[PDB]
């Protein structure tokens, strides 16, 4: 079943932001929860993915 | 063969196109005989009307008459014959073969100024 792989991708998006706290952090700031490869961080704290 | 549509909206199919073109061309020549002979409009319109009337008298087929009158559908050829008739009736009342009504001013068409 491929719905299970969808839900496992959602659970590892929760894991990919460092748990539920960072998950809700990016959910309420970005309105978006998907994880990416961290390309970099500038001298201000902006992170690029 | 009874063409079903001319393709043009508002331009209905003519049932008997040859008789209509003969009546329109002879009526054009009737109106056009009332113009003086030194008027170039009379000479040119008699010339092209005689060409069109001879082509209509020399072709029974509607399609081949369309291809050698060279004016598209036969119904817009009929419409152009009616337009030429109305034009000749207006050109009688205008009398535009006369000399120029007035010379332009001296630098009226000088471009650039």
């Amino acid at each position: 079943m491929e719905l299970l792989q969808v839900l496992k991708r959602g659970l590892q998006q929760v894991s990919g932001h460092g748990g539920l706290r960072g998950y809700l952090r990016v959910l309420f700031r970005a309105n978006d929860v998907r994880v990416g490869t961290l390309v970099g961080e500038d001298k201000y704290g902006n992170k690029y993915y | 063969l009874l063409k079903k549509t001319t393709g043009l909206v508002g331009l209905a199919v003519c049932e008997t196109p040859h008789e209509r073109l003969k009546i329109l061309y002879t009526k054009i020549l009737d109106v056009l005989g009332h113009i003086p002979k030194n008027a170039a409009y009379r000479k040119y319109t008699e010339q092209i009307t005689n060409e069109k009337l001879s082509i209509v008298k020399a072709e029974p087929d509607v399609k081949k008459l369309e291809e050698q009158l060279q004016g598209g559908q036969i119904e817009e050829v009929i419409l152009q014959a009616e337009n030429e008739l109305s034009l000749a009736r207006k050109m009688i009342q205008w009398k535009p073969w006369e000399p120029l009504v007035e010379e332009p001013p001296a630098s009226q068409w000088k471009w650039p100024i």
Binding site: - | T45, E84, L87, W97, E98, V101, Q108, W109
Partner: protein, 208 residues
């Protein structure tokens, strides 16, 4: 002169010259000039009494059939005593061709309205009333079409300034958009650009 020069079309030039002779000899009462440009466009300069006889002819003659009015234009040339140049642009779909019928008027001489020939003209020469002040007699509904309803003057005259004479602002005292004499915070900077050297010796005018 192959790559960068526009290639001259001699067949269309010959055909438009011949048709210009044709129009000039069918209608000698009104036709004043006939000319063909080097880029092969035919201009028929006529007297303004023959707006209706010429344009009907080109609309209705079997060798003209200019059934389309593309554009109708005025041009203000103030050094001419008939300063307005009314330009008709006609399209024959039958003969795949374009003709230009030019005529003249000043501020006080009415041009006859060509709405009975081409209904297309109904707004166009109405624009010529709004922009230039050329009056068209026997027009169905002649009024302004583009300027504001209280507008004074005719803007596309060349003695009319680029900005107007009035400008609008909202005024809170009268609770109303109001018109006031125009002031610009930056004046439009006039640039004198014309070179003091002659560019085209083929267009050299003879001296006095």
């Amino acid at each position: 002169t192959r790559p960068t020069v526009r290639p001259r079309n001699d067949v269309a030039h010959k055909q438009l010259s011949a048709f210009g002779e044709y129009v000039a000899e069918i209608l000698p009462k009104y036709v004043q000039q006939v000319q063909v440009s080097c880029f092969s466009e035919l201009e028929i300069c006529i007297h303004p009494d023959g707006v209706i006889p010429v344009l009907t002819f080109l609309r209705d003659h079997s060798n003209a059939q200019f059934k389309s009015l593309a554009d109708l234009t005025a041009v203000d040339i103030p050094t001419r005593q008939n300063r307005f140049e009314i330009v008709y642009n006609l399209l024959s779909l039958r003969f795949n061709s374009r003709i230009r019928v030019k005529t003249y008027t000043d501020e006080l001489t009415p041009v006859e309205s060509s709405v009975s020939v081409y209904k297309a003209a109904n707004w166009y020469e109405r624009e010529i009333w709004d922009m230039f002040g050329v009056f068209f007699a026997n027009h169905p509904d002649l009024r302004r079409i583009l300027t504001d309803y209280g507008f004074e003057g005719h803007p596309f005259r060349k003695d009319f300034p680029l900005s107007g004479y009035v400008e609008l602002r909202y005024d809170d005292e009268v609770k109303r958009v109001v018109a006031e004499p125009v002031e610009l915070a930056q004046e439009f900077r006039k640039f004198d650009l014309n070179s003091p050297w002659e560019a085209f010796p083929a267009y050299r005018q003879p001296p006095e």
